[PDB]
């Protein structure tokens, strides 16, 4: 059965967890995948989530099944995050939320529920993007259409090219937007374009799908949903895919949420009882350990102050890291200047290399990095900081 | 969009506890869903897995992800589980196991895997069976074809009409067994049965799939493998979808194991490989905590002798309610013999009920069971078994 099976392509981005297994060299610096790493080179548990992993070991009596959509208070509190506290959506009881395995589980959730329960047939997804989005949306059946958004020459959002591409756009379409801290990009639209773009998607008529993995990175926890609510307060129906790997640092317990919402009550429960079967079929129930620590903290105060003060301690590493990068890079002789980092949000730093650079960092300088050069800013330190550099001026 | 969705009918089984939830009656008696329970109606954390979890909670020092394929010596410890310490799988390397979200998401990840990288069409499950088989293998695109299995005037295996039926299954066909505690029938096959369906199914030219969710609750951890193993040694090619959920009372956690099987070494890591992109477009990377805990205990001599200490006991307590349960019925008045349920092994109870019968139990008794005529002997208890037995009775 299985003798004409053909080897896999690699992944573009966790392929490169494999690759830096098998090289033994010792200076090896991972800005690859996004993840956080503190001033030490290390990826550690939040205290809060600590604290909030202690609560459980004590008060837990039962591991008894979740039901279909995870534990209620997560839901609830997913919402609050989302559209705010006293949002219309929560009041008129519009949304509905279910506790998912990780963003990208929350995306295939959604995915499997537009194939199955939509007339949808196309899915519009950045250019650059994330290419986890193709696979996902493809794998359901979906076609995936590209819409321009950068401009490459002045490193900025191109936002007449991005606005006559979705013109390709017809009702009935779903359109994916990066909520906040744009990947890879890290350029994201201002209120003012996010509203043009609400006003005009009500127009087209397009499904909002709204994948929001970094929300407290770019701003805020509330100014990064700025976007997203702009877009709430015009539509009568949207989807949301928020992931609580980064800005709770619990990557590997699979925290995530699928949020659906639609014009009224008697809609969104009929929906979204499909939404369940689709996760009946996959994974039946959620895993409860991450999302109960993220419950846990966000319904408790002083919990939750503690975890807002770390949230902001690392996005405010990531943005002294930027500027130690383009500082050390001009005292190193960089012939070029890459200030332009500066105004990118999130993780990342993208634009100023190509794939043969890339490559070349990582056979010569062990540095590694996404094919398309993007790097993790938030693992650089001030260690590894100067070599970084050197091997980059050296491929400029 | 969503105007015109129809409301999803209820599932079978997982829709028990919507029903559960709005009945507001006292006395409710909760059959249903297969989950263990002490004397005191509770379903305990066991005490080995508190003990992992203070372990961890001590010593994890990051959340940073798995690798696609999950935790490797969790992928160890379950192929010794399965095939033995000296296995020639293990040794001989044609084993690669992926941590997958419970033994449901094991499935999935078996069904995607097959209907893209294989040329298999059809899929056979037993009749009666467990529900969930059909819809998961039917979403990935399969049909599903059904086998005589049980004997319901005798309560045996009818041997004969399972043979007679899987006559029709063409080679490349994917045949279905229940690894051991068959749901919900709690007939298995005896070591001279699963010797004969091997050696049938070499012939035959099957692809074996074996759903293995109760390992140790029929007679033990070693012995519940055998039929397994059987297989195991004249195949070229098996896929195992394995469950942590009932053995570890771990069932919020989804702590389960999709284990494929290939001639060879070469042939399985490019097949695995095919495996691995079916779980990146799906929840791109498994949730850690479950899969620790099995992994610790698994790994720790102490904690693993106090975990078969604690299996012993959930076993060697569904066995005494069988007796109680049988022996109260007599005492009660049922004019008909369940001594039959003496031998069956597993949760559940099966075979003496319609389905008017059980839908009277729970809106006259509010006892709650599956339609089929399934009760969860494993929710029986000292305190509920006597009103438990007097509506029986009272629809017999
Ligand atoms: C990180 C990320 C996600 C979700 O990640 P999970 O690990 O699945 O929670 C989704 N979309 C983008 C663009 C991301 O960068
Ligand atoms: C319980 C069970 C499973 C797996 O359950 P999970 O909760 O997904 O781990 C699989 N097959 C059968 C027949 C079962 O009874």
């Given at each position: 059965m299985?003798?004409?099976?053909?080897?896999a392509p690699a992944?573009?981005?966790?392929?490169l967890?494999?690759?830096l297994?098998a090289?033994?060299?010792?200076?090896?610096?991972?800005?690859?995948?996004?993840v956080?790493?503190?001033?030490?080179?290390?990826?550690?548990?939040l205290?809060?989530?600590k604290?909030?992993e202690?609560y459980l070991?004590?008060?837990?009596?039962?591991?008894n099944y979740?039901?279909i959509?995870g534990i209620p208070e997560?839901?609830?509190?997913?919402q609050?995050l989302?559209?705010?506290?006293?949002?219309?959506?929560?009041?008129?009881?519009?949304?509905r939320?279910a506790?998912?395995p990780?963003?990208?589980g929350?995306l295939?959730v959604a995915?499997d529920?537009?194939?199955?329960?939509?007339?949808?047939?196309?899915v519009?997804?950045?250019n650059?993007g994330?290419?986890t989005?193709?696979?996902?949306?493809?794998?359901?059946?979906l076609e995936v259409?590209?819409?321009?958004?950068?401009?490459?020459?002045?490193?900025?959002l191109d936002?007449?090219?991005?606005?006559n591409?979705?013109?390709?756009?017809?009702?009935?379409?779903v359109?994916?937007?990066?909520?906040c801290c744009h990947?890879?990009?890290?350029?994201?639209?201002?209120?003012?374009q996010?509203?043009t773009?609400?006003?005009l998607s009500?127009?087209?008529?397009?499904?909002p799908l709204?994948d929001?993995?970094?929300?407290?990175?770019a701003?805020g926890l509330?100014?990064?949903?700025?976007?997203?609510?702009?877009f709430?307060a015009?539509?009568?129906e949207?989807?949301?895919?928020?992931?609580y790997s980064k800005?709770?640092?619990?990557?590997?317990?699979?925290?995530?949420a699928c949020?659906?919402v639609?014009?009224?009550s008697e809609?969104?429960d009929?929906?979204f009882?499909?939404?369940k079967?689709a996760?009946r079929?996959?994974?039946?129930?959620?895993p409860?350990?991450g999302?109960?620590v993220?419950?846990?903290?966000?319904?408790?105060?002083?919990?939750?102050?503690?975890?807002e003060?770390?949230?902001?301690?690392?996005?405010q590493?990531?943005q002294?890291?930027?500027?130690?990068?383009v500082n050390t890079?001009?005292?190193?002789?960089?012939?070029?200047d890459?200030?332009?980092t500066?105004?990118?949000?999130g993780?990342?730093?993208?634009g100023?290399?190509?794939?043969?650079?890339?490559?070349?960092?990582?056979?010569?300088?062990?540095?590694?990095?996404?094919?398309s050069?993007?790097?993790?800013?938030?693992?650089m330190t001030?260690?590894?900081?100067?070599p970084?550099?050197?091997?980059?001026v050296?491929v400029?």
């Amino acid at each position: 059965m299985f003798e004409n099976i053909t080897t896999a392509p690699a992944d573009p981005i966790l392929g490169l967890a494999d690759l830096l297994r098998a090289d033994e060299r010792p200076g090896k610096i991972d800005l690859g995948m996004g993840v956080y790493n503190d001033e030490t080179g290390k990826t550690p548990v939040l205290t809060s989530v600590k604290k909030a992993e202690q609560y459980l070991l004590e008060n837990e009596t039962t591991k008894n099944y979740l039901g279909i959509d995870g534990i209620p208070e997560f839901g609830r509190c997913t919402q609050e995050l989302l559209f705010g506290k006293g949002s219309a959506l929560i009041n008129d009881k519009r949304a509905r939320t279910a506790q998912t395995p990780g963003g990208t589980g929350a995306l295939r959730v959604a995915a499997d529920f537009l194939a199955k329960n939509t007339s949808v047939k196309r899915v519009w997804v950045s250019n650059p993007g994330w290419p986890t989005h193709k696979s996902v949306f493809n794998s359901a059946g979906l076609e995936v259409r590209e819409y321009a958004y950068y401009d490459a020459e002045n490193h900025t959002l191109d936002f007449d090219a991005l606005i006559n591409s979705l013109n390709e756009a017809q009702a009935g379409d779903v359109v994916l937007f990066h909520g906040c801290c744009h990947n890879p990009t890290g350029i994201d639209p201002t209120l003012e374009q996010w509203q043009t773009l609400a006003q005009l998607s009500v127009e087209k008529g397009w499904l909002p799908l709204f994948d929001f993995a970094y929300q407290g990175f770019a701003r805020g926890l509330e100014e990064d949903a700025e976007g997203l609510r702009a877009f709430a307060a015009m539509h009568k129906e949207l989807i949301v895919a928020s992931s609580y790997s980064k800005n709770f640092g619990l990557y590997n317990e699979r925290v995530g949420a699928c949020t659906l919402v639609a014009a009224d009550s008697e809609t969104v429960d009929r929906a979204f009882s499909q939404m369940k079967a689709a996760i009946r079929v996959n994974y039946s129930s959620p895993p409860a350990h991450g999302a109960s620590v993220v419950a846990t903290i966000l319904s408790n105060d002083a919990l939750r102050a503690i975890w807002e003060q770390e949230l902001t301690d690392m996005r405010q590493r990531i943005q002294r890291m930027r500027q130690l990068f383009v500082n050390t890079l001009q005292e190193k002789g960089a012939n070029r200047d890459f200030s332009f980092t500066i105004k990118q949000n999130g993780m990342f730093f993208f634009g100023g290399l190509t794939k043969e650079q890339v490559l070349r960092l990582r056979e010569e300088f062990g540095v590694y990095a996404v094919a398309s050069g993007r790097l993790n800013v938030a693992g650089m330190t001030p260690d590894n900081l100067a070599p970084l550099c050197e091997a980059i001026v050296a491929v400029l």
